[PDB]
Design a protein around this ligand. Structure first.
Ligand SMILES: Nc1nc2c(ncn2[C@@H]2O[C@H](COP(=O)(O)OP(=O)(O)OP(=O)(O)O)[C@@H](O)[C@H]2O)c(=O)[nH]1
Ligand SMILES: Nc1nc2c(ncn2[C@@H]2O[C@H](COP(=O)(O)OP(=O)(O)O)[C@@H](O)[C@H]2O)c(=O)[nH]1
Ligand SMILES: COc1ccc(N(C)c2cc(=O)oc3ccccc23)cc1O
Ligand SMILES: [Ca+2]
Ligand SMILES: [Mg+2]
Ligand SMILES: [Mg+2]
Lengths: 428, 333, 437, 54
């Protein structure tokens, strides 16, 4: 277990995907042409997790870029790190998916999926020992959502003993493209519950509110939202990418974070919260990091941690700091809040440290929580689904592609089951 | 903020202690099984000492000394006194005693019993009270349990008016540093019926504890005389003080008992710490010689003294380890 | 002379193995290239150190060791490390996909596929032995490989070498340096499967080692490196009698004979003293009485527990340095009168003592100060069952809700193996209680 | 008190001090259980691929 294969689908998927590669390439010393120009050995020791080595001697992301429309991917190609991607790994159709999960999953996506799997296969064949896959996508559109979940199901069929991991962007009325987002998200959640091992719930509601309430940006763009996403994504993958005292992979993450196979939707958090441009000079103390990383206002999923309990938590501290003081503060916050951590999983809070801080910071903390409070996210989507679905509003966009209302009823029931399955462990 | 757990329901002493810890607001109670506690108020039965002091970044403290049962079971105590050089068979403040098993020191008991009957001096024993060896051993067998046979004290000090028997209860708190603290307030558990040299089957005049006294309540509220009144009596009736005639001996006995088990139970160098509250029961004979009767490992208090003692338990045993934002005589160890 | 084969399984087993072999080389004056100038019989011998080292015609001294991990990166450190020339490449065995902290994956899935190769490489070492007495097996309880694969290997060793002794050096899990939330599962599963196959097992609780490093070495946050240098000193103390001239614990059979009367109750407590910081400017050297007294302090034990509240079945004291019997006996006499030491009624109250006049060797630039005398006490006390109690409770907590169980079931393990393993542990806790109270 | 088994050599000595007197599965069965678990893995995987076929 060395190689991860990365897939990015649709507009959101490709935009957050491109930003992730910009950030991690910078962290690993890699420049737009693929050349290493860094000064630490820690940068290269585990670089094979994400990068292929061409005889070059160039580093090529193990990344496949997928869309049903060309626009966003042309934008990736002419973007900052655009030239670094293997040009054969751009797989795109022409028609788009019209924010329609049925188009992505059943009609338009079906037409393109085999050629994506061909590219997946070529990368997988070149792997010493493939860990599994990470997908970036949103759940509210058509391609990332319908076609992304189609890909996952086809990847699982061909590689049933590999790990599937997603970064899944949840829609919010606060940052909304179409009214059909809750339909697309519910259909997609149904898929994620069955076919991923671990999913980071990146909630556009939370990203918006952080940008507005905390970063004091009166009118957040997608760019501002994505600044938070890429910082979080860098953070959560630190222990996959860098050598440390705990050497992690996608399977060990899943084993230790997921006590029941359906409850695999993580609430990520980050501290210190910053924006692009105006950044703080004031350094953070270990007690301040720890306090901030656990604050509701630092979570990337709009749920109140106090309305539930943590099943498991992984925490990663980056920068030169006292590991002794880290351990003390982490233990302090558990011992002073222990009603919020289930008592039937001993040692359910795990901390790891990496010396390399992210760009522009002296120290940072990244949070990965499996909390029963995530049920709030799913309940919110469920309410929005039902508000339309009770009158069958907007359904003709889906029945026109050959779907039946039964399939909506089934995906709704499965998502409601998930919610009450969370409620079950919040009491005991 | 400190954390604690409660595992003994029936403990009046610790019900009041937890209530007091909550009232400072600087102590939060957790559920029985939450292992992230600073303080355990443990169960009396098979308390899991093995699970304490293994939680990183938590100083842990329990309200029982593991091994203190040696002092607090009647059969264990006799064995301890007899087998410890510190205490010995020569020990002058504990009544001549023998461990008796039924399916063991039965032969040693009978030989000493017959030597008492050489010119026939006072030969009355306790198990429940009898004058001849045969009815004693027959009673023990009727039970199917281990018990102690003990030289019953035939010449007690008898309170006047009323020709009444009594035992003294002393409260002793041993902290985590093995300081031995004697609570300044004791209590006498009185009999209400005149003491009867001739009739050993009548049990309300020979046995003194608070329950088996249901003529009750006649001379003092609930058959409980306190130290002020008892000292007053001793001055008026016997021309001595409680300090001189009784308490010196009480302090000696308590100290000897606890110093003897100290190497076996001390938590000085351990990964968790212990404290415990003991109830020592004393008999006084008519020449004002004190005898130890019982050590109780889970004593209750006298109603009047709950508030003061429980507050004292919090002051010297709990806050000494876990500081916030003397009613005891320290017996020099 | 009778040979011993050392087997190092998983990350913990391998890194500890590295530290032990480094120390063994320093003690016997074997250089990193495998040359031993003081060994005058070139290319052969039946000296005591040949129990652990074979010899080549060129005069290379090669550990009778195999290193196995289900992943390459830890054993790769050995391949390119300062002691790289010491080992034959055949002795260093790696798979590709690890056990993912999952016993079932180390035992069934990934185990099934590498077991035959490991046994073949062990057979190669055993063929070179004139009278192989058996095996020393180093592993964690908590790791997927250290637990899962180890129990598989042990079963197969009982089949292929039924007359041979098997000893364990086992790392018991501690949250302070743990890597997995399922370590209590893996520990109970490996102990159940290994119990019948192990003759004597030395448990080392990472909690005890961690705190010793903090308290006595002033290391603020101990690393695996700190821990393993200390562990290797204790292991060396234990194995010294197999590697040097003497008349106590000379063979593996004698370990069981002297330490294990009742075969299931085979976990002796190790206590070591003194542990003194190399950075300590002024240090008053400790006497035989002081080091021996320290063997009865919970703070110096390999596993934190309270022997005053259990019973001893056996006790060996193993001294290194300037120590004579008279000082040992005088120390014991005064300790007997101050400490609670109670043997079981059906055993003599006594001590087997071994003295080796060579002081402990220390790793140059290490954390441990050189001392004039040291002792390791091995006592079989019922008090070590506190560690089982702790572990069984943690297991019960998770298992009552079946948390994480699906990860094991998905590797082909049946749910029933959990309750089977756990019932065996319940019987073990009872055994200790019957013997000890 | 009583010192027995005194043995001395150049390297050291050993002795005993007494303070007070007293008062497997087959290769076949292993391969069976390993194959049984492999069959549970094959079956659970076949169940998955059938669901994916539907
Ligand atoms: N004392 C010590 N403990 C270690 C070391 N390495 C790992 N551990 C402990 O062993 C446990 C984890 O098991 P590992 O041995 O790392 O796992 P593994 O056997 O390689 O199995 P995988 O799960 O396949 O990686 C944890 O409790 C660690 O604290 C070491 O070098 N020294
Ligand atoms: N955070 C974030 N959300 C996005 C971005 N682009 C689109 N979205 C969200 O994604 C959803 C629409 O899906 P999109 O990816 O545009 O459609 P697709 O191309 O068919 O997959 C809506 O919920 C949008 O709010 C982005 O760059 N960042
Ligand atoms: C609840 O206990 C645990 C949770 C997670 C982990 N592992 C394996 C991690 C893997 C990873 O990719 O990122 C991490 C970052 C910080 C801490 C742990 C992990 C281990 C644990 O015991
Ligand atoms: Ca030789
Ligand atoms: Mg769009
Ligand atoms: Mg490993």
């Amino acid at each position: 277990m060395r190689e991860i294969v990365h897939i990015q689908a649709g507009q959101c998927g490709n935009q957050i995907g491109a930003k992730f590669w910009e950030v991690i390439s910078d962290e690993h010393g890699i420049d737009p042409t693929g050349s290493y120009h860094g000064d630490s050995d820690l940068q290269l020791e585990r670089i094979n997790v994400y990068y292929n080595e061409a005889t070059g001697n160039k580093y090529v992301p193990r990344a496949i870029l997928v869309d049903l429309e060309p626009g966003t991917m042309d934008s990736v190609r002419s973007g900052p790190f655009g030239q670094i991607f293997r040009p054969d790994n751009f797989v795109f159709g022409q028609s788009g998916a019209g924010n329609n999960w049925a188009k992505g999953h059943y009609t338009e996506g079906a037409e393109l999926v085999d050629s994506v799997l061909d590219v997946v296969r070529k990368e997988s064949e070149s792997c010493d020992c493939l860990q599994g896959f990470q997908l970036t996508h949103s759940l509210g559109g058509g391609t990332g959502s319908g076609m992304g979940t189609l890909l996952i199901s086809k990847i699982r069929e061909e590689y049933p003993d590999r790990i599937m991991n997603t970064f899944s962007v949840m829609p919010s009325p606060k940052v909304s493209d179409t009214v059909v987002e809750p339909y697309n998200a519910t259909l997609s959640v149904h898929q994620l519950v069955e076919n991923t091992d671990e999913t980071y719930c990146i909630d556009n509601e939370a990203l918006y509110d952080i940008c507005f309430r905390t970063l004091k940006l009166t009118t957040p763009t997608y760019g501002d939202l994505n600044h938070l996403v890429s910082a979080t994504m860098s953070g959560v993958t630190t222990c996959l990418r860098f050598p440390g005292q705990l050497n992690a992979d996608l399977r060990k993450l899943a084993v230790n974070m997921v006590p029941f196979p359906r409850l695999h939707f993580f609430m990520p958090g980050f501290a210190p919260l910053t924006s692009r441009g105006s950044q703080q000079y004031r350094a953070l103390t270990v007690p301040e990091l720890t306090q901030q990383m656990f604050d509701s206002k630092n979570m990337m999923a709009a749920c109140d941690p106090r309305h539930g309990r943590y099943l498991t938590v992984a925490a990663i501290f980056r920068g030169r700091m006292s590991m002794k003081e880290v351990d003390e503060q982490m233990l302090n916050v558990q011992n002073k809040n222990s009603s919020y951590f289930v008592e039937w999983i001993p040692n359910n809070v795990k901390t790891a440290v990496c010396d390399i801080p992210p760009r522009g910071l002296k120290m940072s903390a990244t949070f990965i929580g499996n909390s029963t409070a995530i049920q709030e996210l799913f309940k919110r989507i469920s309410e929005q689904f039902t508000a339309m679905f009770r009158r069958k509003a907007f359904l003709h966009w889906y029945t026109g592609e050959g779907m039946d209302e039964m399939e909506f009823t089934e995906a709704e029931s499965n998502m409601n089951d998930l919610v009450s399955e969370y409620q079950q462990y919040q009491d005991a | 903020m400190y954390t604690f757990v409660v595992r003994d329901e029936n403990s009046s002493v610790y019900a009041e202690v937890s209530r007091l810890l909550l009232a400072t607001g600087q102590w939060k109670r957790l559920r029985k099984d939450n292992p992230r506690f600073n303080l355990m108020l443990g169960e009396r039965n098979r308390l899991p000492f093995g699970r304490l002091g293994h939680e990183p970044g938590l100083v842990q403290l329990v309200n029982y000394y593991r091994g203190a049962d040696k002092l607090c079971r009647k059969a264990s105590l006799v064995k301890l006194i007899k087998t410890s050089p510190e205490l010995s068979e020569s020990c002058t403040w504990f009544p001549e005693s023998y461990v008796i098993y039924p399916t063991d020191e039965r032969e040693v008991f009978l030989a000493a019993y017959n030597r008492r009957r050489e010119g026939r001096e006072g030969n009355v024993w306790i198990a429940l009270i009898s004058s001849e060896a045969s009815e004693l051993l027959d009673f023990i067998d009727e039970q199917g349990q281990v018990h102690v046979i003990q030289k019953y004290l035939e010449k007690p000090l008898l309170l006047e008016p009323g020709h009444r028997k009594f035992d003294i209860r002393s409260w002793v708190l041993v902290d985590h540093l093995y300081n031995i603290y004697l609570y300044r307030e004791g209590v006498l558990r009185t009999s209400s019926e005149p003491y009867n040299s001739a009739n050993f089957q009548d049990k309300t005049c020979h046995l003194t504890n608070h329950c088996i006294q249901k003529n009750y309540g006649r001379y003092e509220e609930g058959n409980e005389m306190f130290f002020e009144e008892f000292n007053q009596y001793l001055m008026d009736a016997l021309n001595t003080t409680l300090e001189n005639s009784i308490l010196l001996q009480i302090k000696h006995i308590i100290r000897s008992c606890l110093m003897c088990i100290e190497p076996a139970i001390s938590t000085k160098h351990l990964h968790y710490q212990s404290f415990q509250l003991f109830g020592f029961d004393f008999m006084v004979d008519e020449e004002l010689k004190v005898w130890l009767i019982e050590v109780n490992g889970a004593p209750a208090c006298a109603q009047k003294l709950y508030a003061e003692l429980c507050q004292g338990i919090v002051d010297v045993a709990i806050s000494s380890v876990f500081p916030l934002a003397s009613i005891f005589i320290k017996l020099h160890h | 002379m009778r040979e011993c084969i050392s087997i190092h399984v998983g990350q913990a087993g391998v890194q500890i193995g590295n530290a032990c072999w480094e120390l063994y080389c320093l003690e016997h004056g074997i250089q990193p290239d495998g040359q031993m100038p003081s060994d005058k019989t070139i290319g052969g011998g039946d000296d005591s150190f040949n129990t652990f080292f074979s010899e080549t015609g060129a005069g290379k001294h090669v550990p009778r060791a195999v290193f196995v991990d289900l992943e390459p990166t830890v054993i790769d450190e050995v391949r390119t490390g300062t002691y790289r020339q010491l080992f034959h490449p055949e002795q260093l065995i790696t798979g590709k996909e690890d056990a993912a902290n999952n016993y079932a994956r180390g035992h069934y899935t990934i185990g099934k596929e590498i077991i035959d190769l490991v046994l073949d490489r062990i057979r190669k070492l055993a063929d070179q032995c004139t009278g192989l007495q058996g095996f020393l097996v180093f592993h964690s309880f908590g790791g997927g490989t250290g637990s899962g694969f180890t129990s598989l290997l042990m079963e197969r060793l009982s089949v292929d070498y039924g007359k041979k002794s098997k000893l364990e050096f086992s790392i018991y899990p501690a949250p302070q340096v743990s890597t997995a939330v399922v370590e209590p599962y893996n520990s109970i599963l490996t102990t159940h499967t290994t119990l019948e196959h192990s003759d004597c097992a030395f448990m080392v609780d990472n909690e005890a080692i961690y705190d010793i490093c903090r308290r006595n070495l002033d290391i603020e946050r101990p690393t695996y490196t700190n821990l393993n240098r200390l562990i290797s000193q204790i292991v060396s103390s234990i194995t010294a009698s197999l590697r040097f001239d003497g008349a106590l614990n000379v063979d593996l059979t004698e370990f069981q004979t002297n330490l294990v009367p009742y075969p299931r109750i085979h976990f002796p407590l190790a206590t070591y003293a003194p542990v003194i910081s190399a950075e300590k400017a002024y240090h008053e050297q400790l006497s035989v009485a002081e080091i021996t007294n320290a063997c009865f302090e919970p703070a110096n034990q390999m596993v934190k527990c309270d022997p005053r509240h259990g019973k001893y079945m056996a006790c060996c004291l193993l001294y290194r340095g300037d120590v004579v019997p008279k000082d040992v006996n005088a120390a014991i006499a005064t300790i007997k009168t101050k400490r609670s030491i109670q043997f079981v009624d059906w055993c003599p109250t006594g001590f087997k003592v071994g003295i080796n006049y060579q002081p402990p060797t220390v790793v140059p630039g290490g954390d441990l100060a050189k001392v004039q005398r040291a002792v390791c006490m091995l006592s079989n006390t019922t008090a070590i069952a506190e560690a089982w109690a702790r572990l069984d409770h943690k297991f019960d907590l998770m298992y009552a809700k079946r948390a994480f169980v699906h990860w094991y079931v998905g590797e082909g393990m049946e749910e029933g193996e959990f309750s089977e393993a756990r019932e065996d542990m319940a019987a073990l806790e009872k055994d200790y209680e019957e013997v000890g109270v | 008190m009583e010192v027995i088994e005194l043995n001395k050599c150049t390297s050291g000595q050993s002795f005993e001090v007494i303070l007070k007197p007293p008062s497997d599965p087959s290769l076949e069965e292993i391969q069976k259980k390993l194959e049984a678990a492999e069959e549970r893995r094959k079956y659970q995987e076949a169940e998955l691929l059938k669901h994916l076929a539907e």
